[PDB]
Design a protein around this ligand. Structure first.
Ligand SMILES: Cc1cc2nc3c(=O)[nH]c(=O)nc-3n(C[C@H](O)[C@H](O)[C@H](O)COP(=O)(O)O)c2cc1C
Length: 443
C-alpha cells in the first residue's frame, strides 16, 4: 500500500459543503479546487503557427478522469490567446481571431463536457506569457516595460521585451475577451485570469517589471488597470452567470511596499470588479516535516503569510482559495478558518481521485511521494508525467514506492536527453514512461 501524509483529524465533512459564488450565482459543489497545471498535451508544430493548440484526445481524457474525481472546481492549465505567445510548446490556444466552431472549438467543448459530466465546475485558466515566452517561440515579446527575463536556470532563454503600446494592450484585452466568449460558448463554467508566476498580468502587477509612467504604471490601481479593463470588457460579452476568477501570487507583491493600504485596494479591486473568487498562492499553509534546507524559501513563505492574512479576512463577496502544499485533511480543514476553499495541484496529478477518497473517508492524506517537496523542478516533472499517463488512460505511477523511483528517474534522465537534443523543436510534453508495468486507469 502507498505511504501517505498523516492527518491530525479524520473529519473532512466541512470540505464537502458547496460554495456559492456571489456574482455569477453558480456554486462549486464542494470546497476542493484542482489547481491549474500546464499539461503540454495540445497540438504542437515548431514551424507552423495555426497547427498549434488544439486539445488532444489524451488531454480530453485527462479531464474526463478528473471529472470523475469528486472535485468542486477544476481549473485547466493556462490557455494561450495567440499562436506565438506560449508558456510552452503543447499549450492549448484560443487564438484571438478564431471562430466559435470547427475542430479546435469542438475539442475545447469536448474537454469541458467531460470535465463537468459529473457536476464539477470546469474553469479555463487564460494567460499571456508576456516577457516569459522563449525566444525560439517569440523573438519580440511584449511586457509592461522592457525588463528582460535574464539567465533562466533551465535550458530556455527569453528575448528582451518591448513595452506594450496602447494598441498592444487593446489586442491583449481582446484576446482575453475572445477567450472568455469562446470558453462560454464551448460550455465552460468560467474563466480564471492568470495573474501569477511572472506571466503578463503579473508583469503589470509587479514594480520590478512595470516601470511604466502612463495610466498602467505606478500605483497599485494603475498596475491593476489592465486586469480591470479585461474584466470590464469580458462583462460586455459573456453572461453574468459565467464565473470569473483570478490567481494571485504573493511573489508579485513581495519586497515592494505592500501594506494594509495596498491590501485594502486589492480587495476593493477584486470585489468592485465582481470576481467570484481569488486563488491565493506563493507559499504553503500546511508545513512540511523539516524535510530539507529552508534558507532559499524563507523570505517567500514569510511574505505569503502576510499576503494571505491581509487579503482573505477582508474579502466577503469574493470567495478565497489557497493553493500550495496541502496534503492532509487536518490542515485543509484548518485552512477553512481563513479561506473558503483549498486548492490542490501536485496531489491531484498523483491521485486524480483524491477528493472523492477524502470525502468518502477512505484516506485522510495524499500519497507521500519519495521526492523532496522543495525540489520544485522534480516535483513539477513528476506531476506532468502523471498527467501524461492519465491522458493515455493509464493509472499514475505510485512514487511513494522505492521500486518506482528508480525507473522514473531513469526516464527523467532520458527525457532531459531528448529535450537537450531537440534541435528541430518537434519534441514537447512531459516524460514518456518506459515501464511495461503501467496499468489501465483505475488499476
Ligand atoms: C506540472 C505543473 C504545472 C502547473 N501549471 C500551472 C499553470 O498552468 N497555471 C498556474 O497558475 N499554476 C500552475 N501550476 C501551479 C499549481 O497550480 C499550484 O499553484 C502549485 O503546484 C502549488 O500547489 P500544490 O502544492 O498543491 O501542487 C503548475 C504546477 C505544476 C506542478
Amino acid at each position: 500500500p502507498s505511504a501517505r501524509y498523516e492527518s491530525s483529524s479524520s473529519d473532512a465533512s466541512a470540505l464537502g459543503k458547496p460554495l456559492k459564488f456571489e456574482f455569477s450565482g453558480q456554486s462549486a459543489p464542494n470546497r476542493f479546487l484542482k489547481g491549474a497545471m500546464t499539461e503540454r498535451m495540445s497540438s504542437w508544430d515548431p514551424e507552423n503557427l495555426e497547427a498549434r493548440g488544439v486539445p488532444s484526445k489524451n488531454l480530453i481524457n485527462l479531464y474526463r478522469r478528473w471529472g470523475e474525481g469528486g472535485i468542486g472546481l477544476i481549473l485547466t492549465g493556462n490557455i494561450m490567446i495567440e499562436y506565438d505567445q506560449l508558456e510552452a510548446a503543447g499549450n492549448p490556444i484560443i487564438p484571438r481571431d478564431s471562430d466559435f466552431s470547427g475542430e479546435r472549438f469542438e475539442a475545447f467543448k469536448e474537454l469541458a463536457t467531460e470535465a463537468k459530466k459529473h457536476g464539477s465546475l470546469i474553469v479555463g485558466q487564460v494567460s499571456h506569457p508576456g516577457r516569459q515566452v522563449e525566444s525560439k517561440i517569440q523573438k519580440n515579446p511584449v511586457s509592461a516595460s522592457d525588463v528582460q527575463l535574464k539567465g533562466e536556470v533551465m535550458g530556455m532563454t527569453f528575448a528582451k521585451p518591448r513595452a506594450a503600446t496602447d494598441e498592444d494592450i487593446a489586442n491583449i484585452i481582446q484576446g482575453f475577451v475572445h477567450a472568455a466568449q469562446y470558453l462560454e460558448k464551448a460550455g465552460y463554467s468560467g474563466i480564471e485570469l492568470h495573474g501569477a508566476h511572472g506571466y503578463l498580468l503579473a508583469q503589470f502587477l509587479s514594480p520590478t517589471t512595470n516601470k511604466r509612467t502612463d495610466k498602467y504604471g505606478g500605483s497599485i490601481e494603475n498596475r491593476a488597470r489592465i486586469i480591470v479593463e479585461i474584466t470590464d470588457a469580458i462583462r460586455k460579452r459573456v453572461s453574468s452567470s459565467f464565473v470569473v476568477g483570478i490567481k494571485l501570487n504573493s511573489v508579485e507583491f513581495q519586497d515592494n511596499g505592500f501594506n494594509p493600504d495596498e491590501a485594502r485596494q486589492i480587495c476593493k479591486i477584486l470585489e468592485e470588479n465582481k470576481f467570484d473568487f481569488v486563488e491565493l498562492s506563493g507559499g504553503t499553509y500546511e508545513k512540511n516535516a523539516f524535510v530539507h534546507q529552508r534558507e532559499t524559501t524563507k523570505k517567500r513563505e514569510g511574505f505569503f503569510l502576510e499576503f494571505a492574512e491581509s487579503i482573505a479576512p477582508v474579502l466577503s463577496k469574493t470567495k478565497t482559495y489557497i493553493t500550495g502544499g496541502f496534503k492532509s485533511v487536518g490542515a485543509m480543514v484548518a485552512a477553512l478558518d481563513v479561506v473558503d476553499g483549498v486548492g490542490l495541484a501536485r496531489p491531484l496529478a498523483q491521485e486524480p481521485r483524491l477528493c472523492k477518497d477524502i470525502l468518502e473517508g477512505t484516506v485522510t492524506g495524499a500519497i507521500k511521494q519519495r521526492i523532496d517537496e522543495n525540489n520544485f523542478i522534480l516535483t513539477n516533472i513528476a506531476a506532468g508525467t502523471q498527467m501524461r499517463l492519465v491522458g493515455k488512460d493509464q493509472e499514475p505511477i505510485d512514487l511513494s514506492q522505492e521500486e518506482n523511483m528508480g525507473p522514473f528517474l531513469q526516464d527523467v534522465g532520458t527525457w532531459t536527453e531528448k529535450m537537450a537534443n531537440n534541435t528541430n523543436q518537434r519534441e514537447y510534453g512531459y516524460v514518456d514512461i518506459t515501464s511495461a508495468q503501467v496499468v489501465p486507469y483505475g488499476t
